[PDB]
Amino acid sequence: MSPEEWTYLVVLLISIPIGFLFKKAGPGLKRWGAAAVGLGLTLFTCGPHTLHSLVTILGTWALIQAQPCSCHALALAWTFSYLLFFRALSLLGLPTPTPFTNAVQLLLTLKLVSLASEVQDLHLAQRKEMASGFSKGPTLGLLPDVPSLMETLSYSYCYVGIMTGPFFRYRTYLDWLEQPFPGAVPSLRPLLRRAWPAPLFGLLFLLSSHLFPLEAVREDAFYARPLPARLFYMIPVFFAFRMRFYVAWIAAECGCIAAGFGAYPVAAKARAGGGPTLQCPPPSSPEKAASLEYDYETIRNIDCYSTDFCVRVRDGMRYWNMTVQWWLAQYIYKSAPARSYVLRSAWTMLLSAYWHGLHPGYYLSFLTIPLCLAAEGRLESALRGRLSPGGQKAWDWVHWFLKMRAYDYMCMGFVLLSLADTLRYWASIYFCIHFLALAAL
C-alpha cells in the first residue's frame, strides 16, 4: 500500500461528490468549474511537472492550425516522440516525474490524438462539402466547429478521466456540456447498480495481496519451493492484479456516472467508448427525458463477468479496457500500413506496449501474447467443429481453465517489470505455457 497509490485512491473516491455537485451546474459554469478542478488537482498531485502536459496540448493545437490537412499523422508522431522525450528525463538529467505524471501523460496522449483525428475528419468533411456543392445534414459524431485554444484547455483538464480515465472522445465532452435538463438523467440508481461489488472486490484484493505478496518471487528462497508450490502461487498474483484494476476502474466509472458524463439514450445503441452509433432526438421536456431509459456504457471500461469467465483469449482481451481498446482499434489498427492480420496485430501490440512504458517487461509480455493468440486461432478453427455437444462443454471448461492460466502466466512477466527476474521466474516454471502453445500451434 504505497502512499502514491493511496493518494490515487483518495482522489478517485473524492471524484464522486464533485460529480454530484457539478451535475446540476449549467453548461458554461460546469465547463469552467470542471476545468478549474482538473487543473487544481493536476497541480496538487503533479507539482511543477504540469509543464510537460501544457507543452503537449500547445503543440497539438499549433499542429492543428499549422497543417489542418495532415494534422492526424503529424500530431500522432509529435505526441509519440514527446512521450519518448518525457520518459528519458533521467537519460538527460532532468528531474524525474511521479507516476501520476506518467498516467496523466498517457491519458492526454490518447485524448489529443483523438481530437486531432476529429479535426482532420471534420476538415476533410468541409472540403468535400464545398467540393460537391451539396451541403449534407448534421452527421452524428462530427464536431460542429474547430475548437479554440481555451476550449481545448477546458476539455483536456476535465476532472473526469484525467488521472485514471477512462478515455472519452471530445464529442462526448460536447454532448455532456450541451445535455439539456441535467436533473432528469438518473445518477444514484446506476451508481448503486455498479458500486455494489466495489467493497467486496477491494476486500478480495487486499486478501490476496496480504496472503501472497508479489515481492516473494524477487527473493531467491521462493524458488527452492517445489514446482507445485509455484503453480499454486502463480494464480493469486494475477488474481490480485485483476482485482485491483477492477476496483480502480469500477470506482472510476462510478465517479464518472456521478457527474452524468457519458449518459446517452438506450435507443442510440451506443458503443463502449465509441459513443452513439444511431442518432436519437434530444428530449423536448424534462418529463419526457425522465421517461426515457439511460445507460452509461460509453464510459464503461471493463466488464467483470465477461473477462473473468470468458472462453477465448481474443474475446477476453476485447472486453479488457474497452475504451482504450476502441481507441487503438480505430486510430492504429485501421491506419496500420500492413495488410496481414498477424502483422497488424503485432503493430497494435507494439504500440500498446510503447504506450504502457519503455520497460522490457511490457515488450516481452506483448510479444509473447501473439504466439498463444495464433495457436488458439489455429487450434479452435481446426478442432471445434469435430467435437460433440458434451465434448463442446468439456472443451469450453478446459479452455476457460487454460485461458485463465495463460493470463496468470503472462501476468507475472508483465508485473515483475525487470528483465532478469522475469526471465528467472519464467525459466523456473520451465516455459510450461510456451511449450504447450507451440504444441497447440
Author numbering: 1 to 441
What does the paper say about this structure?
To enable biochemical and structural analyses of human MBOAT7, we purified recombinantly expressed enzyme in detergent and reconstituted it into amphipol PMAL-C8. We used single-particle cryo-EM to obtain a density map of MBOAT7 at an overall resolution of ~3.7 Å, allowing us to build a model of the entire protein except the C-terminal region (442–472), which was not visible and presumably disordered. MBOAT7 comprises 11 transmembrane (TM) helical segments, connected by short intervening helices (IH) and loops. The monomeric protein occupies a space of ~36 × 58 × 28 Å, embedded in the membrane, resembling the shape of a saddle. TM8, containing the putative catalytic His356 residue, resides in the cavity between the two TM bundles. TM8 exhibits weaker density than the other TMs, indicating flexibility or multiple conformations in the apo state of the enzyme (TM8 density shown in two σ values). A tunnel twists through MBOAT7, connecting the cytoplasmic and the ER lumenal sides of the enzyme, with the active site located in the middle of this tunnel. In MBOAT7, the lateral opening of the tunnel has an extended channel that branches off to the lumenal leaflet of the ER membrane. In contrast, TM helices 1 and 2 of MBOAT7 occlude the equivalent lateral gate region. Compared with other MBOAT structures, our cryo-EM structure of MBOAT7 is distinct, inasmuch as TM6 is divided into two short helices linked by two evolutionarily conserved proline residues that are not found in MBOATs 1, 2, or 5.
Membrane-bound O-acyltransferase (MBOAT) 7 acylates lyso-phosphatidylinositol (lyso-PI) with arachidonyl-CoA. To adjust membrane properties according to need and to store specific fatty acids as precursors for bioactive lipids, cells remodel the phospholipid acyl chains in enzymatic reactions known as the Lands cycle. MBOAT7 mutations cause brain developmental disorders, and reduced expression is linked to fatty liver disease. Here, we report the structure and a model for the catalytic mechanism of human MBOAT7.
